[PDB]
């Protein structure tokens, strides 16, 4: 099912149909602040961001990039950096060659190149720089910055149809056309297929699915997939997952970014967490152990069940750094915590290891299952720490080198 694509290396990270779908993010510190940006790149990388983007918006930002890269390399952090260019990318890349060389990838937006004839020249200049330095490029369209000349073109084509489409449908058409035309122009200039990634983001899920299906049909490039401007909190999380899932299940998408608005004081790493959860939920990557647990209902005996589930989740997170170093494959661990006999044994048998608490009407004992069979039955006090010891014993055996 995975769409075949050429491989594009973003630094040491390969993107494309033969490679795992890469998680990426973008900093939100001012790029001119070397200390703050370096720190956030590191933080994002440590959280799971395999590629990190930073805006390169003005001369002060450009001047900071080589120093950011130097500091990352000094700690052996080889996380690739993507520069995000708008309006003046051709000028910054021309004027600051050390910045152009320090970056691992350039992002161009076909709607933020300039006016009229200037747009093609600016484009060309950026692509020439990339070719000269052997850098990959993302041609990233976004409907928040759609090339107006292209929109008018397609509106006029639409108006000629026997059955014109809606204005909204035409905007989607223009967005795809913008990406596809810029992709083909870059190819025609001599930028290699191993150096082009495409995106074309919109902020509504159903629209994103239409767009990406069209991009995937009309191009061969690896695709950077994300729902732009997803918003805040649960809404932003849900919309992001709902938009990406249909496309990922159809084999479309080579790298993802989750565009969450942080709440004031919420860490910028949250979007990385959500990206990882999307991929893992769909079986496309394994990053860390996970917990399958029922909602609980009036059959569940006390607040113990919710406490135990949370304690297990916490413990897995705490053990992971050590486990990752010792036990190959542990990222695939699935642990169940269940509230009663209705689904508890059966769901637990589908995990690597699971506990079925006794709910209402049951004898006060908790069977524990591993590899689909009864392992033991726990009773009394301290069931949580007993179970967590059995999980540790399980991991040490199952994921032994």
Binding annotation for [4Fe-4S] cluster? 294, 297, 340, 347
Locate 97 and state its tokens. 């060659």
Compute the Cα dihedral for 44, 49, 52, 53 and give only its sign.
negative
Number of residues that bind ligand CDI (CB under 6 A): 17
How far CA 352 is from CA of 91, 115, 117, 376, 395, in Å, comes to 55, 59, 61, 14, 9
Position 306 contacts a copy of itself (CB under 8 A) = yes
Whole-angstrom Cα distance, residue 218 to residue 3? 12
Residue 291: contacted member of ligand CDI, ligand SF4, a copy of itself, none (CB under 5 to 8 Å, by partner type): a copy of itself
Residue 124 beta carbon to ligand SF4: minimum distance, rounded to whole angstroms: 23
Distance of CA 308 to the CA centre of its chain: 30
Of the candidate spans 12-20, 30-38, 130-138, 177-185, the one that interacts with a copy of itself by CB under 8 A turns out to be: 30-38
Q: Which is nearer to ligand CDI, 76 or 298 (CB)?
A: 298
Whole-angstrom Cα distance, residue 248 to residue 333? 22
Of the candidate spans 11-19, 94-102, 128-136, 257-265, the one that interacts with a copy of itself by CB under 8 A turns out to be: 257-265
The answer to whether the CB of 252 falls within 8 A of the CB of 3 is yes
Residue 95 beta carbon to ligand CDI: minimum distance, rounded to whole angstroms: 21
DSSP string, 13-61: EEESTTSPPEEEEE--S-TT-HHHHHHHHHHHHHHT-SEEEEE--SHHH
Residue 140: contacted member of ligand SF4, ligand CDI, a copy of itself, none (CB under 5 to 8 Å, by partner type): ligand CDI
Binding mask 203-242 for a copy of itself (x = CB under 8 A): xxxx--x------------------xxxxxxxx-xxx-xx
Alpha helices by DSSP H, listed for 219-295, are 233-249, 270-281
Q: Which of residues 165-204 bind ligand CDI (CB under 6 A)?
A: 199, 201
- Interface with a copy of itself (CB under 8 A), residue from 145, 158, 220, 376: 145
Binding site for ligand SF4 (CB under 6 A): 294-297, 299-300, 338-340, 342-344, 359
The torsion angles phi and psi of 121, rounded to 5 degrees, stand at -70, -40
Whole-angstrom Cα distance, residue 243 to residue 249? 11
Position 297 contacts ligand CDI (CB under 6 A) = yes
Q: Which of residues 86-145 bind ligand CDI (CB under 6 A)?
A: 109, 140, 142, 145
Site residues (vs ligand CDI, CB under 6 A): 84, 109, 140, 142, 145, 199, 201, 226, 228-229, 257, 259, 294-295, 297, 342-343
């Amino acid at each position: 099912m995975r769409r075949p694509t050429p491989t594009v290396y973003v630094g040491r990270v390969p993107i494309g149909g033969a490679h795992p779908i890469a998680v990426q993010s973008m900093t939100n510190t001012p790029t001119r602040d070397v200390e703050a940006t370096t720190a956030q790149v590191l933080e994002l990388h440590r959280a799971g961001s395999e590629i990190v983007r930073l805006t390169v918006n003005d001369e002060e930002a450009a001047k900071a990039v080589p120093e950011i890269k130097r500091r990352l390399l000094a700690e052996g952090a080889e996380v690739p950096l993507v520069g995000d260019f708008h309006f003046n990318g051709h000028l910054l890349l021309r004027k600051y060659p050390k910045m152009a060389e320090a970056l691992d990838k350039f992002r161009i937006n076909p709607g933020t190149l300039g006016r009229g004839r200037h747009k093609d020249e600016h484009f060309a200049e950026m692509i020439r720089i990339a070719m000269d330095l052997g850098k990959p490029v993302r041609i990233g369209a976004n409907w928040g910055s759609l090339d107006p000349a292209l929109l008018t073109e397609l509106m006029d084509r639409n108006a000629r149809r026997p059955e014109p489409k809606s204005a909204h449908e035409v905007v989607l058409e223009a967005l795809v056309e913008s990406a596809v035309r810029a992709y083909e122009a870059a190819l025609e200039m001599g930028l290699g297929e191993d150096k082009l990634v495409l995106s074309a983001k919109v902020s509504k899920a159903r629209d994103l699915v239409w767009v990406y299906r069209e991009l995937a049909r009309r191009t061969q490039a690896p695709l950077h997939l994300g729902l732009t401007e997803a918003g805040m909190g649960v809404k932003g999380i849900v919309a992001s997952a709902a938009a990406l899932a249909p496309l990922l299940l159809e084999g479309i998408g080579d790298t993802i970014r989750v565009s969450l608005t942080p709440a004031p004081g919420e860490p910028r790493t949250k979007e990385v967490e959500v990206a990882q959860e999307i991929l893992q939920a769909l079986g496309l990557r394994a990053f860390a152990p996970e917990v399958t647990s029922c909602p609980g209902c009036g059959r569940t005996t006390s607040t113990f069940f919710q406490e135990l589930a949370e304690e297990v989740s916490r413990r897995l997170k705490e053990r992971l750094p050590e486990w990752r170093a010792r036990y190959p494959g542990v990222e695939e661990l699935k642990v169940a915590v269940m509230g009663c006999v209705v689904n508890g044994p059966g769901e637990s048998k589908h995990a690597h290891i699971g506990i079925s608490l006794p709910g209402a009407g049951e004898e006060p004992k908790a069977p524990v299952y591993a590899d689909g069979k009864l392992l033991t039955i726990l009773k009394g006090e301290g069931i949580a720490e007993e179970f967590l010891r059995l999980v540790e014993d399980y991991v040490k055996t199952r994921f032994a080198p």
